[PDB]
Amino acid sequence: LGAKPFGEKKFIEIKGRRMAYIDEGTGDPILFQHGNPTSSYLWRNIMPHCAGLGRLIACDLIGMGDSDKLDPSGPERYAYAEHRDYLDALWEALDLGDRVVLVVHDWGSALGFDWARRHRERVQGIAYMEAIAMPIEWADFPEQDRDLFQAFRSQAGEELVLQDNVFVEQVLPGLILRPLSEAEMAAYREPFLAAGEARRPTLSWPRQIPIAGTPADVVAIARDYAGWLSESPIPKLFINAEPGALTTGRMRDFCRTWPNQTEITVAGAHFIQEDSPDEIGAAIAAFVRRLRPA
Numbered sequence: 001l002g003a004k005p006f007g008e009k010k011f012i013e014i015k016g017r018r019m020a021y022i023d024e025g026t027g028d029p030i031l032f033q034h035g036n037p038t039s040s041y042l043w044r045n046i047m048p049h050c051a052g053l054g055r056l057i058a059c060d061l062i063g064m065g066d067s068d069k070l071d072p073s074g075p076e077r078y079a080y081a082e083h084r085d086y087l088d089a090l091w092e093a094l095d096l097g098d099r100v101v102l103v104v105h106d107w108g109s110a111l112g113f114d115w116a117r118r119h120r121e122r123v124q125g126i127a128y129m130e131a132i133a134m135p136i137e138w139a140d141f142p143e144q145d146r147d148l149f150q151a152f153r154s155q156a157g158e159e160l161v162l163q164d165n166v167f168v169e170q171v172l173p174g175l176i177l178r179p180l181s182e183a184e185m186a187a188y189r190e191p192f193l194a195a196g197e198a199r200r201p202t203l204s205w206p207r208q209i210p211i212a213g214t215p216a217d218v219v220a221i222a223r224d225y226a227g228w229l230s231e232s233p234i235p236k237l238f239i240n241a242e243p244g245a246l247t248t249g250r251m252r253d254f255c256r257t258w259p260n261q262t263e264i265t266v267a268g269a270h271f272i273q274e275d276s277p278d279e280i281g282a283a284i285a286a287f288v289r290r291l292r293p294a
């Protein structure tokens, strides 16, 4: 529990942009990456469990958290390839070394799994949850939000997201089992208080999801790391959720097939970090300890 952020935000300029992140401690980094429509804040009650286990880092994706907005912004801004271009340069700047443990969720898993494949030699371990593990079909998508997501990927997505901020105000609270506090909702809605383009990142993300073959570039990237992950001996901690949301059904069947993997299930829907922060935190800290004996 806790509405307070973990650590203090530091800033660094990337491709003329300036991105925000948390960088606490020393040693090999334990990289936590949030997805849509959150920020580093999502890991505020989990990162504490890893204290003294390494350099704890949580980056705010471009256009998200305290990171700068891209401008001009529009229907083509914030696609996956653009977020990766900024995340790659941010991770390079932070001098992470070659024994990085990745802790990912949602789009962070898409970005994390991809970076991991491209930089496999540098990856010590991967702890993932409610992730985009492979390209999917609509039938694999959580039914309660299926029509809503098909709507984000239609001309109605602009009104829903840019005008009404649906992903932050409806999706987020809706996929967390416990009632959030006033301060916790403030921290999540802060980067998107302004109607219009400031919220563009939270609409471009659902349009990037590799569902029913589109978009093709993202599908290919996901087909890429899913293939790789299924055969990689890199240690993995799969934090499964009940009832879970995204990583259930076929995708979960698939993830349960990955090598050298430890699994645990915690209570939660999608943004499970809000429902079982300590169960998740404890597990990750244990995972890292076994990966870093001493």
Ligand SMILES: [Br-]
Residues within 6 Å of the ligand: 036, 205, 206, 207, 209
């Ligand atoms: Br999304």
Ligand SMILES: [Ca+2]
Residues within 6 Å of the ligand: 097, 099
């Ligand atoms: Ca070293």
Ligand SMILES: [Ca+2]
Residues within 6 Å of the ligand: 146, 147, 150
């Ligand atoms: Ca429908």
Ligand SMILES: [Ca+2]
Residues within 6 Å of the ligand: 173, 174, 175, 176, 177, 178, 179
């Ligand atoms: Ca709820």
